[PDB]
Amino acid sequence: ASVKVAVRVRPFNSREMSRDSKCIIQMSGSTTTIVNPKQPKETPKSFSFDYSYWSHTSPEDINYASQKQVYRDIGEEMLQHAFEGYNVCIFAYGQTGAGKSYTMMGKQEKDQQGIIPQLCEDLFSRINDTTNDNMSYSVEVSYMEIYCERVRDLLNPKNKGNLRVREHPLLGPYVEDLSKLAVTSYNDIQDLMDSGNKPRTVAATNMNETSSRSHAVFNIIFTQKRHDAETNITTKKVSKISLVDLAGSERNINKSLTTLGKVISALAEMFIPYRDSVLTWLLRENLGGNSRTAMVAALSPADINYDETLSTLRYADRAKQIRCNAIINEDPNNKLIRELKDEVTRLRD
Numbered sequence: 001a002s003v004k005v006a007v008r009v010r011p012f013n014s015r016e017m018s019r020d021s022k023c024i025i026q027m028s029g030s031t032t033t034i035v036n037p038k039q040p041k042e043t044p045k046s047f048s049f050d051y052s053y054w055s056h057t058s059p060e061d062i063n064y065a066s067q068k069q070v071y072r073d074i075g076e077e078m079l080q081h082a083f084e085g086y087n088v089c090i091f092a093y094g095q096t097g098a099g100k101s102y103t104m105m106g107k108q109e110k111d112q113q114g115i116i117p118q119l120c121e122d123l124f125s126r127i128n129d130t131t132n133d134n135m136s137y138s139v140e141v142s143y144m145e146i147y148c149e150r151v152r153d154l155l156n157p158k159n160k161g162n163l164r165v166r167e168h169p170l171l172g173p174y175v176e177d178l179s180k181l182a183v184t185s186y187n188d189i190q191d192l193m194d195s196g197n198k199p200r201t202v203a204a205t206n207m208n209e210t211s212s213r214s215h216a217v218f219n220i221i222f223t224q225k226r227h228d229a230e231t232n233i234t235t236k237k238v239s240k241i242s243l244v245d246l247a248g249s250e251r252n253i254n255k256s257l258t259t260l261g262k263v264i265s266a267l268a269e270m271f272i273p274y275r276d277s278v279l280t281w282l283l284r285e286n287l288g289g290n291s292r293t294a295m296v297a298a299l300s301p302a303d304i305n306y307d308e309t310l311s312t313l314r315y316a317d318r319a320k321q322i323r324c325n326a327i328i329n330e331d332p333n334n335k336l337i338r339e340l341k342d343e344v345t346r347l348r349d
């Protein structure tokens with residue numbers, strides 16, 4: 001399968017309104033067009049994605065791409081793939097202020113919740129709707145920040161540790177001593193998300209908002225346990241769901257962001273510089289390995305952001321060419337069960 005790619009243009013923000021910005025983004029069907037406001041004579045550049053989300057107006061518009069609509073396209077599809085037993089990844093990419101955090105986290109005030117809360121609510125709603133007493137489940141959450149190549153645990157802020165990223169000699173990269181907490185309700189996972197969001201690194205340069213240079217990775221380990229009555233074997237399906245709010249794409253400590261660009265470019269071109277940054281190392285499987293992966297590229301509508309928005313569209317266009325190699329998590333015991341059961345009914349006959 002391919003990396004799925006959506007782009008999303010937001011309303012003007014305060015900085016843009018301040019400079020009487022005009023809109024340089026047009027969307028129709030799956031295509032996004034960007035005009036060059038500095039060379040108005042040159043022909044607009046057009047790009048085709050899995051989705052082009054027009055969120056430039058307000059939810060009063062019939063044509064406004066809502067939080068619900070964005071979730072119901074990519075978020076629901078990836079949660080369904082996790083239920084099938086695939087590892088899944090959604091990452092939000094783009095310039096500072098373009099709408100990565102709004103898309104991934106959103107706000108609680110007025111159905112503004114983003115992909116992460118909607119997926120968590122959908123996950124627990126599906127688990128709690130289970131009617132088969134042979135199905136049992138486990139949900140483990142981890143939430144980390146990568147800032148200047150240092151890893152912090154957002155679920156245990158009293159660990160000023162800069163957790164070490166390691167390659168397991170057989171099982172691939174992991175964050176040594178990163179909290180992995182069992183959660184049994186949507187309320188519990190929401191409180192951890194909220195607490196984790198508050199522990200993110202702030203910067204004076206961003207008026208003491210969350211640093212524009214910090215990556216946030218939200219991971220769920222979803223374990224589905226099927227109890228077989230006849231055999232008493234329990235089969236396990238395990239899926240890792242990685243929901244990523246990247247550092248701002250604009251332009252040592254931009255190592256991760258710059259390396260992600262080279263990784264996307266090298267994967268689109270198909271050596272691969274995964275290990276040159278903590279982000280691309282930890283997300284190696286999600287960037288062309290054992291994962292179903294989607295990119296949501298946030299776009300400023302404003303003339304003043306032409307060059308950065310064009311760069312986001314070109315990286316999004318390249319991500320579309322990446323192939324993944326996701327396999328279903330298979331318990332070998334599923335075959336032992338089928339055998340043991342045939343062998344017994346046959347004797348019983």
Ligand SMILES: Nc1ncnc2c1ncn2[C@@H]1O[C@H](COP(=O)(O)OP(=O)(O)O)[C@@H](O)[C@H]1O
Pocket residue numbers: 009010011013055094095096097098099100101102103248298
């Ligand atoms: N689709 C959208 N509709 C409405 N407001 C949006 C949308 N996307 C972003 N915003 C708003 O734009 C501003 C910047 O978005 P934000 O998510 O903080 O950007 P980033 O995380 O990319 O730096 C915020 O005030 C946010 O609420």
